[PDB]
Amino acid sequence: GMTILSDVKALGQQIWLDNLSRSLVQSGELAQMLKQGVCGVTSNPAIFQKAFAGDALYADEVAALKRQNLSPKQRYETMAVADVRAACDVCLAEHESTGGKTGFVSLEVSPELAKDAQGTVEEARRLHAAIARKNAMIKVPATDAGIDALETLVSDGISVNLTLLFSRAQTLKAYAAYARGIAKRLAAGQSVAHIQVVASFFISRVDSALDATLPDRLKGKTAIALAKAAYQDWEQYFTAPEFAALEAQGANRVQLLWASTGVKNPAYPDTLYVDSLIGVHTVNTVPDATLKAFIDHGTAKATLTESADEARARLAEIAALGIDVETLAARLQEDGLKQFEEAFEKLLAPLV
């Protein structure tokens, strides 16, 4: 039942909605979610493509914007920034109530910037200013250029959702970049206590890539095993003396955020990923059908740290089979970028 969201909060995990649209906010639905236990919102270009195509409240806004001398991208950004502003306003009471730890809304930069660190910084600073809300996160793909940009943006005091992570190694590189940016601010006497970063580590796409060729004892296990190992890495990195010296001065840890947590394979229970990944100081962003499945028949238990030995043993067998999860991660990141660019070009066409 609905109280499960609060039960998961008591276990230390925030549940965010992996959807955004003009009607979600305007209808009052988001506000009612923010009072039932939902704690934030994520978007991406595919989410906006679907929203723009299906939500009747965009029609008048597009007609208005087509009367102005604007590029398709600016028309999109005006629409998306307006949705994000409005959602931030709905989430602001939640955000302020925790000292700025919850109640975030994320907006992703253009996919074409993913390998351009300077361009990413420029667009992220611009979108941060355009939204003009303390609870907005700018969402940046975790390419090498994105990790470069993360350090700069953190040093600028901007909260970031670093996305398209599939790799434990790349996630550790992101933590190090974050820490460098925090250290910069502390050295300059600048605030750090409101800077929040999440590392959006993708789940279902790993199983989708591998399961058809895995042996039976591993089908549907790899993504969860990776996530459990990533969380062990997180505990080690953020408790170490190096980070503790920053946390003592007000720095926040990065948090892992489980993304792509809708189940794609009908052979697995629809709550598999949510049920399996609950642990303290994490986030899980879910699509609306998964949110409703979890409310209906999910389970709130601290599963993320259970049986880490088995997770390791499974990852050892994945390697034994010749699957290099680092090569896989790079391929999944590049393919996610291609898919997001396709979605973005698809949403821009009707805005010409």
Residues classed as catalytic: 139
Question: Which amino acid appears at position 5 of this protein?
Answer: L
Question: Which amino acid appears at position 88 of this protein?
Answer: C
- Phi, psi at 163, each rounded to 5°: -115, 175
Whole-angstrom distance, CA of residue 81 vs CA of residue 109: 11
Q: Is 100 exposed, middle or buried, given 0-12, 13-18 or 19+ CB atoms closer than 10 A?
A: middle
Give me the half-sphere count of Cα atoms (radius 13 Å) on the Cβ side of residue 270: 13
Beta strands in the chain (DSSP E): 13-17, 40-42, 104-108, 136-141, 160-165, 197-202, 255-259, 282-286
Whole-angstrom distance, CA of residue 241 vs CA of residue 243: 6
Whole-angstrom distance, CA of residue 319 vs CA of residue 312: 11
User: DSSP assignment, residue 110?
Assistant: P
| Helix and strand numbers, DSSP H then E, in the chain | 16, 8
- Residue 239 makes CB contacts below 8 A (sequence gap 6+) with none
